[PDB]
Amino acid sequence: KKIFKPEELRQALMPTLEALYRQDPESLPFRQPVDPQLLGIPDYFDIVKSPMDLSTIKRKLDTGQYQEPWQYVDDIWLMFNNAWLYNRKTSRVYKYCSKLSEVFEQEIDPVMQSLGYCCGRKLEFSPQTLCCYGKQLCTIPRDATYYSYQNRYHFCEKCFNEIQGESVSLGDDPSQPQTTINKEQFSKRKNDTLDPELFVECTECGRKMHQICVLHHEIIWPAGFVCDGCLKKSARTRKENKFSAKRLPSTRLGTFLENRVNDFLRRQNHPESGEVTVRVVHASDKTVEVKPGMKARFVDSGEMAESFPYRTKALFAFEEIDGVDLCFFGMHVQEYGSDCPPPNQRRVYISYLDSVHFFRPKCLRTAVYHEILIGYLEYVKKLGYTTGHIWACPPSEGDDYIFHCHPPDQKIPKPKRLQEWFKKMLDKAVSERIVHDYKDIFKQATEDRLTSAKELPYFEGDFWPNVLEESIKESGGSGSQKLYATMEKHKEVFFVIRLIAGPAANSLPPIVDPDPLIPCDLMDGRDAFLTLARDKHLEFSSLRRAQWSTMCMLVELHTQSQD
Amino acid sequence: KKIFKPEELRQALMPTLEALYRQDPESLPFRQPVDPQLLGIPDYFDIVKSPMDLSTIKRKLDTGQYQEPWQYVDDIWLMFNNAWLYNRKTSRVYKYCSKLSEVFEQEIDPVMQSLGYCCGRKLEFSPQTLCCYGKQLCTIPRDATYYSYQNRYHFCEKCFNEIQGESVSLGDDPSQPQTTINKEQFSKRKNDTLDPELFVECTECGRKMHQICVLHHEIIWPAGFVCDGCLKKSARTRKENKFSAKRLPSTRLGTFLENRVNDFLRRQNHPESGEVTVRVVHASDKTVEVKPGMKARFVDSGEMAESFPYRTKALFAFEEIDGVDLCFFGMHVQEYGSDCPPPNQRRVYISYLDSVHFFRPKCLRTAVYHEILIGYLEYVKKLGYTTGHIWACPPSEGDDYIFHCHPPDQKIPKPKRLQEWFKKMLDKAVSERIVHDYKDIFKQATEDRLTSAKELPYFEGDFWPNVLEESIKESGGSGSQKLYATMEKHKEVFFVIRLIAGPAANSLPPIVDPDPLIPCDLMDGRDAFLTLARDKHLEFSSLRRAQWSTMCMLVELHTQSQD
Numbered sequence A, B: 001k002k003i004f005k006p007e008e009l010r011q012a013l014m015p016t017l018e019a020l021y022r023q024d025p026e027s028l029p030f031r032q033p034v035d036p037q038l039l040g041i042p043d044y045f046d047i048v049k050s051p052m053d054l055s056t057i058k059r060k061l062d063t064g065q066y067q068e069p070w071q072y073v074d075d076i077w078l079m080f081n082n083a084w085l086y087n088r089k090t091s092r093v094y095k096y097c098s099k100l101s102e103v104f105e106q107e108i109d110p111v112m113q114s115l116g117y118c119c120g121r122k123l124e125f126s127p128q129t130l131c132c133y134g135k136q137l138c139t140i141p142r143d144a145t146y147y148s149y150q151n152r153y154h155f156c157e158k159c160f161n162e163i164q165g166e167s168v169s170l171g172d173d174p175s176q177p178q179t180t181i182n183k184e185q186f187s188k189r190k191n192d193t194l195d196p197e198l199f200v201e202c203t204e205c206g207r208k209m210h211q212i213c214v215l216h217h218e219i220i221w222p223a224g225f226v227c228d229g230c231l232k233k234s235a236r237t238r239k240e241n242k243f244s245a246k247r248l249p250s251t252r253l254g255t256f257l258e259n260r261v262n263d264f265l266r267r268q269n270h271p272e273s274g275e276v277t278v279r280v281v282h283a284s285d286k287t288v289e290v291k292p293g294m295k296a297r298f299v300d301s302g303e304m305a306e307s308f309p310y311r312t313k314a315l316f317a318f319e320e321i322d323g324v325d326l327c328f329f330g331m332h333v334q335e336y337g338s339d340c341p342p343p344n345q346r347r348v349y350i351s352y353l354d355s356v357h358f359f360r361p362k363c364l365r366t367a368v369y370h371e372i373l374i375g376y377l378e379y380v381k382k383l384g385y386t387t388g389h390i391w392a393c394p395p396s397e398g399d400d401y402i403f404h405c406h407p408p409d410q411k412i413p414k415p416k417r418l419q420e421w422f423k424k425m426l427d428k429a430v431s432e433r434i435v436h437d438y439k440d441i442f443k444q445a446t447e448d449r450l451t452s453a454k455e456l457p458y459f460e461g462d463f464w465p466n467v468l469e470e471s472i473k474e475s476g477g478s479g480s481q482k483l484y485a486t487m488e489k490h491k492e493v494f495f496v497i498r499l500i501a502g503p504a505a506n507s508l509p510p511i512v513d514p515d516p517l518i519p520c521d522l523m524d525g526r527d528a529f530l531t532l533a534r535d536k537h538l539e540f541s542s543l544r545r546a547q548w549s550t551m552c553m554l555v556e557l558h559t560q561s562q563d
């Protein structure tokens, strides 16, 4: 019901238009309508379907042809966009248009906020990286050229010509079907699509606002979105967000971890700090099956179990930033209890761990990650797990372990840095008398005097079961030939962590998890959360997006159980 | 003297050569000598004046032709650049070489420190931009084509071709007459010159180690450089550096500022922190002379003083990092005491202010800057100065206020940030009862009810003297027509800080500096330090470089006073 008078707009908007005029000599190609004849370029109007310049925008602002502020922002970007679509990253017009937008990004935000809006940015989702289907490590970066069929199966232009002739094997994904598709049936594409961010309208104002900015979810507030401005003018606020990190069900594991982190934070008494919530959101019983090579060498002759049972758990840590939950750490673990046979007995394995670097304060981020991890080791140690195993291997270019689409400026560690990061955490744990000691897989195997692949712990998704299949094949049926060699080669990447050692490790009681099972398909393994994020445009790439993603993650965790 | 056994060099260096070999398929074009025939590229043996590859480097490392480890590092980088030059970054060959180099960067550093060297990086100083002579604001970027006479006068590609007639008038540079020079007598260069870092030999072991890495100065330790290892082999260490930041002569002002900062760090109790040393390294008395325009309008009239006397000071803050001094902040001020006629009477002005972002801990950096600023404003108040002035404006791209060549990842704030930065600093000083109030120049002029330009503080180098020249000139003789308008246009950038408000001004005691004069040509204004740095290749671009520059800066300060 809010009416905007054409003179209250120019009162607010014109300053930021003038600030674009005032840039000598950067605004020249924009000050008056582009005239293709007067610059000799007949291929202009055919490339720019609807053009814009500075005076056209000014005329509309002076006459009164802008109903609402976004129309003015939209034209301003239209003008920039045409200008980028013609010139290259190399010319002068481009450089100029960059400057104006750069200047405009600066002025528009306060002004738009003056008018009662969330911001003044034009916001879109940069094209995600896709999975090349040929190599299995192959990746498709933004702007690259790729081939799709039914928008499922995409191929990197290199991988695609590495195919035999014109017939492509495809859809080997679920079950038996080997549907064979011809090359002619594919779409040649550029991974360059830009989806805009969505707006939500205020049911009292009428103002378009960025969904992600105002954090409005249809499930949490089904009455409809009411902007802060309107809420303040009636001395009221939003309903409580019942779907919070804090209100996720508690478990002993979570309570233990968060107490540790929070106690740690208190002793620091650092001023930017806020309390950390830790929640276990998945817990289920699984079995890993020994693969066919190792099964035929060791299982069929009864030297090794055909499978090992383990519990898998997914846990996340959250912090309140600007009065809103943000998810900053995640981890999936595998726990092989006392009922599991050798050699996996009483071992825990960290499948995957991951983070988004928005924890406040930056100063204590690493230390908190170390605290959560050391705390996990301390928990399972008390219950009776004797040993922990960690495969320290950073994700490859544009892969994400748990959180879809990280911030562009959250550097990923190289192997050395990651290995030293783990050595630091474990050294801490060694000095608190929690971890007894640790060694790389090779020094450990020597220590334990092992002589056969069958003595190596065998975890779901780990590196060793795969290399053992190759070992047995390549060596003609042996299970020891290149074992110590392979262990040397990769040694500094494979941490083996002794929580309980010596004679003490032999006369221990049964391991009992006081926590109950927690079914939750969304976090059974890591692929579902990644898919959910890919599917719903969730990103962890900026604080505001991480906040919204977190908000959605929670709504999913809460509405999955209740039915 | 340490000749290396050829065996020492194989069992240390091969792991890094094998690491490059291990890269399938990224080392394929580098495995064999480039036989231009087999490929289909004729011009190889003319552009690459010497080819290099992994087979040849393997040959030498096995036959012991490598005398010292740096030859191996050169050949590795010989090979990389050869391939990096012949292709552009578009191709496949170039990308491959880039992965290779990153692998080598990751492998070589531990290996070289095992061989007793500082590091294994190949280091050079990237060219700095140069002043174009034509526009007098024109600039020559790295890699841009340009023209030069002697090594003094340079011209951008376009500027040079935009002087018609084929003769150039160089010699605006001195106050000596205007010579003229042919166009044939200029050199066509490219700005692609890279200077290697210098090495220093150890007088015992004989290894080349990077000067900047081991911080050896001919003047500090004139009995030759001895490496860290050789000192550790003799149960002895380097003679105490007598040219420290700490041993710079103290001042009552210096001591006041550092006592504030260090009390501040003690109260914070943050476990990363080092002590801060503030020293004033320049104090000279000067006078700013009213420029021609205003001189004619107001001075000859008898309405305002022809020139104002001020004291100028330069003060730097240092921190101990890895046991070495690092200069991290710098400020020049202009102090207009009680002997100074209006309107400048009892006003301080911050000429310039700069920083290098390596202060530990990061999370206290901004606070410490503020404590220094709030400390200065508190010191001048207690001395009897009523009013401080700050021209909040960040440096242009590629420009440096005080420290030459900043780190590439030290973001420079945009105006709205820098403005908010001074507000946070001031609000704290108002919280602390030190600053009474502060306002923008336009609101302050309105309160003081000013009516004429003769009433505005006239500071050396500040924005207003220049703009007042232009205003009188364009208005045809008027002293104050655009005045309030001009002040309004830039209000947000000119801070007016009131230290003593109201009645006090009428009869405060005279202002006396308890500190003596510190003559120091190097720190008289900002140009001499920038110039020294540009001349001696001093940079503040990394921790190691910034440390070396601090060492030289400190040597230069210590050896002007003494003869």
Ligand SMILES: CC(=O)N[C@H](CCCCNC(=O)CSCCNC(=O)CCNC(=O)[C@H](O)C(C)(C)COP(=O)(O)OP(=O)(O)OC[C@H]1O[C@@H](n2cnc3c(N)ncnc32)[C@H](O)[C@@H]1OP(=O)(O)O)C(N)=O
Pocket (backbone or CB within 6 Å): A350, A351, A352, A353, A354, A355, A356, A357, A362, A365, A366, A367, A369, A390, A391, A392, A393, A394, A395, A396, A401, A410, A411, A412, A413, A414, A417, A421
């Ligand atoms: C099947 C198969 O084949 N392969 C595999 C099998 C998978 C095995 C799974 N194994 C595991 O899951 C256990 S190890 C994996 C670790 N997880 C990740 O790495 C995910 C992404 N990384 C992160 O979330 C964080 O980086 C984290 C590792 C949590 C630590 O963050 P941090 O903040 O405590 O330290 P920092 O990151 O070094 O940064 C701390 C400082 O170092 C800086 N820094 C970091 N990296 C770099 C760099 N590369 N260059 C320069 N600086 C750099 C960073 O900027 C920063 O500065 P500051 O704090 O001053 O701002 C598969 N399934 O795909």
Ligand SMILES: CC(=O)N[C@H](CCCCNC(=O)CSCCNC(=O)CCNC(=O)[C@H](O)C(C)(C)COP(=O)(O)OP(=O)(O)OC[C@H]1O[C@@H](n2cnc3c(N)ncnc32)[C@H](O)[C@@H]1OP(=O)(O)O)C(N)=O
Pocket (backbone or CB within 6 Å): B350, B351, B352, B353, B354, B355, B356, B357, B365, B366, B369, B390, B391, B392, B393, B394, B395, B396, B401, B410, B411, B412, B413, B414, B417, B418, B421
């Ligand atoms: C003649 C004429 O026409 N014109 C002029 C006339 C001269 C007038 C002279 N006036 C003055 O001397 C007074 S104005 C002060 C200007 N001095 C400088 O600007 C030197 C370069 N800048 C700095 O040394 C520092 O930035 C400093 C100003 C000390 C503040 O450092 P900081 O660290 O406390 O705050 P932060 O930098 O904002 O950073 C604080 C956070 O904000 C971040 N940040 C900073 N800038 C940006 C940015 N642009 N974009 C995004 N993020 C950004 C930064 O990375 C960071 O994150 P974190 O702490 O999590 O890492 C002439 N003569 O040429």
Ligand SMILES: [Zn+2]
Pocket (backbone or CB within 6 Å): A118, A119, A120, A121, A209, A210, A213
């Ligand atoms: Zn918004």
Ligand SMILES: [Zn+2]
Pocket (backbone or CB within 6 Å): A132, A134, A135, A138, A155, A156, A157, A158, A159, A160
């Ligand atoms: Zn491909």
Ligand SMILES: [Zn+2]
Pocket (backbone or CB within 6 Å): A202, A203, A204, A205, A206, A207, A226, A227, A228, A229, A230
């Ligand atoms: Zn509203």
Ligand SMILES: [Zn+2]
Pocket (backbone or CB within 6 Å): A270, A361, A363, A364, B270, B361, B363, B364
């Ligand atoms: Zn801190």
Ligand SMILES: [Zn+2]
Pocket (backbone or CB within 6 Å): B118, B119, B120, B121, B209, B210, B213
């Ligand atoms: Zn070095």
Ligand SMILES: [Zn+2]
Pocket (backbone or CB within 6 Å): B132, B134, B135, B138, B139, B155, B156, B157, B158, B159, B160
């Ligand atoms: Zn030029």
Ligand SMILES: [Zn+2]
Pocket (backbone or CB within 6 Å): B202, B204, B205, B206, B207, B226, B227, B228, B229, B230
């Ligand atoms: Zn030596």
